[PDB]
Structures are given as structure tokens and as C-alpha cells.
Write an enzyme that holds these catalytic residues in place. Structure first.
Site, PDB file in Angstrom:
ATOM      1  N   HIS A  33       0.825  -1.216   0.000  1.00 56.26           N
ATOM      2  CA  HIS A  33       0.000   0.000   0.000  1.00 56.26           C
ATOM      3  C   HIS A  33       0.852   1.254   0.000  1.00 56.26           C
ATOM      4  O   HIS A  33       0.432   2.398  -0.368  1.00 56.26           O
ATOM      5  CB  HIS A  33      -1.157   0.009   1.038  1.00 56.26           C
ATOM      6  CG  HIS A  33      -0.660   0.178   2.436  1.00 56.26           C
ATOM      7  ND1 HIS A  33      -0.340  -0.914   3.235  1.00 56.26           N
ATOM      8  CD2 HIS A  33      -0.377   1.301   3.146  1.00 56.26           C
ATOM      9  CE1 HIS A  33       0.162  -0.430   4.373  1.00 56.26           C
ATOM     10  NE2 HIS A  33       0.188   0.877   4.345  1.00 56.26           N
ATOM     11  N   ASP A  63       0.060  -7.577   0.443  1.00 48.00           N
ATOM     12  CA  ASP A  63       0.437  -6.270   0.859  1.00 48.00           C
ATOM     13  C   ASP A  63       1.957  -6.232   0.972  1.00 48.00           C
ATOM     14  O   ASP A  63       2.487  -6.179   2.051  1.00 48.00           O
ATOM     15  CB  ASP A  63      -0.180  -5.822   2.194  1.00 48.00           C
ATOM     16  CG  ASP A  63      -0.132  -4.338   2.414  1.00 48.00           C
ATOM     17  OD1 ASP A  63       0.501  -3.681   1.496  1.00 48.00           O
ATOM     18  OD2 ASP A  63      -0.741  -3.763   3.334  1.00 48.00           O
ATOM     19  N   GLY A 139       2.590   5.596   9.856  1.00 48.26           N
ATOM     20  CA  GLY A 139       4.004   5.784   9.615  1.00 48.26           C
ATOM     21  C   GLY A 139       4.757   4.500   9.775  1.00 48.26           C
ATOM     22  O   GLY A 139       5.890   4.315   9.267  1.00 48.26           O
ATOM     23  N   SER A 141       3.665   1.576   8.708  1.00 49.11           N
ATOM     24  CA  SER A 141       3.463   0.671   7.538  1.00 49.11           C
ATOM     25  C   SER A 141       4.756   0.220   6.867  1.00 49.11           C
ATOM     26  O   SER A 141       5.612   1.027   6.694  1.00 49.11           O
ATOM     27  CB  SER A 141       2.680   1.325   6.435  1.00 49.11           C
ATOM     28  OG  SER A 141       1.309   1.140   6.796  1.00 49.11           O
ATOM     29  N   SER A 156       1.187  -4.218   7.993  1.00 48.81           N
ATOM     30  CA  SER A 156       0.167  -3.749   7.093  1.00 48.81           C
ATOM     31  C   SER A 156      -0.824  -2.745   7.675  1.00 48.81           C
ATOM     32  O   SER A 156      -1.023  -1.609   7.231  1.00 48.81           O
ATOM     33  CB  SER A 156      -0.505  -4.926   6.412  1.00 48.81           C
ATOM     34  OG  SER A 156      -1.662  -4.477   5.688  1.00 48.81           O
TER      35      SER A 156
END
Lengths: 185, 51
Positions: A33, A63, A139, A141, A156
Site C-alpha cells: 500500500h 500487501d 508511519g 506501515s 500492514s
């Protein structure tokens, strides 16, 4: 730069997951993402230090994404913060794990479930995810989930936060490694 | 930002902050909108970016 460190794209900030390589080509994994629609990545909010450009991006459904390093001098440590990573492994229920990300730093917890489906909305559903009781906040991720010297997943999404406690889902790292033909080091 | 399709049970964790009327910086739209729902539509957007 290492696992957990901040990465900036044109749109926002994520975390570097793991430094990986294939032959003599270095890359880093992060969330899909984050790589979706990003081309170039930088190491600073000023966008002065280039890291590289996206090479693959898989989101939704999965992801994970991978970015190819174009910066020749930046050190590419095979660690997570100072922690060495030596191999990748499959998550199991009850496994103790640790996450590092650019907003919250380092937090620990355990794997609570496997193969979970997380529906982010608008048709962004991801499948096959690892559920844990580790918190994570915006932040964080794409940062690493590891256990000791073993790489396990990429951050994720989830709910809650680090003050009150929360649930975070991670993308199994083995799947990403396999798709791109790369390996941790 | 429209928070109509909220609440959502989970949010991704990328960072693209918004400033809420409570002066809190929300890490991303999904976090923002879930707070809006949680406040029963009392929280609004001040502006984009950090507070």
C-alpha cells in the site's frame, strides 16, 4: 539505513521493512500500500537523499512491494535497527515477535492468528495475514516484524494504538521473498 | 475528506497527516474518519497536514 527506518514517497511516509538482495542487486521490501503509485523513494522528508525506485507492488490481495536501490553510497544494513536478521521463517500461533517502525519505534507481542482477512474498504481486501497483539500507528506501515534473527512479516494495518493497546496484521515475508526471487542477508 | 463509508475495522499505517478540530494530528484519513465516527460526528477537519 535499516529495517524500521523512515522512507518517503511522493505522497507520505512509511517504514523500510527489510534489506534484501538478488545476486548483486539490492532492494528493500515495504508495504504494497506504500509502493502503490509511488515511483521514487527518499531517506528524508526533504527528499534530498534518494533511495531508489519502485520495482514491484502488490496491493490489495497481498500487501508487499519492493524498491530497487539506485543510491550507491547509502549503507544497506541487513538488520532491523541494530538487530541482525539472518533468515526468514513462517509465523506460528503463540510466537513471540517484535515490530519496529518509524513512528512508534520498537514494540513486542505475539502471533494470535494466521490466514486472516482484513478488509480496508473500497475493495481493498488483503488475505492470508498474520494477526498479532502488537500495536502500530501511522508511519509504521511496511516495517519489519521479526523474532530474534528471523524475519517474519511486514506491517500492514490494524486498530487501536500503542497507548491503549491494539491489533496489527502483517503480510508474511516469505511470500514476498519468493515472488521477487530475493533473499534477506 | 468524506467519512461516510466509516467506520472501518482496520486502517493501513501510512503517514499522511490531517489536523482535527481537537487539535490532534491524525496519521491518516482512515484514522481520522474512525475518530469522527467515534465522536459521533462531533470532530471535524481543521486543515490538511500536521496541526
Amino acid at each position: 539505513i535499516s529495517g524500521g527506518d523512515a522512507i518517503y514517497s511522493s505522497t507520505g511516509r512509511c517504514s523500510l521493512g527489510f534489506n534484501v538482495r538478488s545476486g548483486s542487486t539490492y532492494y528493500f521490501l515495504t508495504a504494497g500500500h506504500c509502493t502503490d503509485g509511488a515511483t521514487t523513494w527518499w531517506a528524508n522528508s526533504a527528499r534530498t537523499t534518494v533511495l531508489g525506485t519502485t520495482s514491484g507492488s502488490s496491493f490489495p490481495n497481498n500487501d508487499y512491494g519492493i524498491v530497487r536501490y539506485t543510491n550507491t553510497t547509502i549503507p544497506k544494513d541487513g538488520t532491523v535497527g541494530g538487530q541482525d536478521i539472518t533468515s526468514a521463517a513462517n509465523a506460528t500461533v503463540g510466537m513471540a515477535v517484535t515490530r519496529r517502525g518509524s513512528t512508534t519505534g520498537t514494540h513486542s507481542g505475539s502471533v494470535t492468528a494466521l490466514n486472516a482477512t482484513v478488509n480496508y474498504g473500497g475493495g481493498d481486501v488483503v488475505y492470508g495475514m498474520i494477526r498479532t497483539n502488537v500495536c502500530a500507528e501511522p508511519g509504521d506501515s511496511g516495517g519489519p516484524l521479526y523474532s530474534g534473527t528471523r524475519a517474519i512479516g511486514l506491517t500492514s494495518g490494524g486498530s487501536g494504538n500503542c497507548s491503549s493497546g491494539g491489533t496489527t496484521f502483517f503480510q508474511p515475508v516469505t511470500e514476498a521473498l519468493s515472488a521477487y526471487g530475493v533473499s534477506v542477508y | 475528506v468524506d467519512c461516510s463509508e466509516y467506520p472501518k475495522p482496520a486502517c493501513t499505517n501510512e503517514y499522511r497527516p490531517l489536523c482535527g478540530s481537537d487539535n490532534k494530528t491524525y496519521g491518516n484519513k482512515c484514522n481520522f474518519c474512525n475518530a469522527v465516527v467515534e465522536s459521533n460526528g462531533t470532530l471535524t477537519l481543521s486543515h490538511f497536514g500536521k496541526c
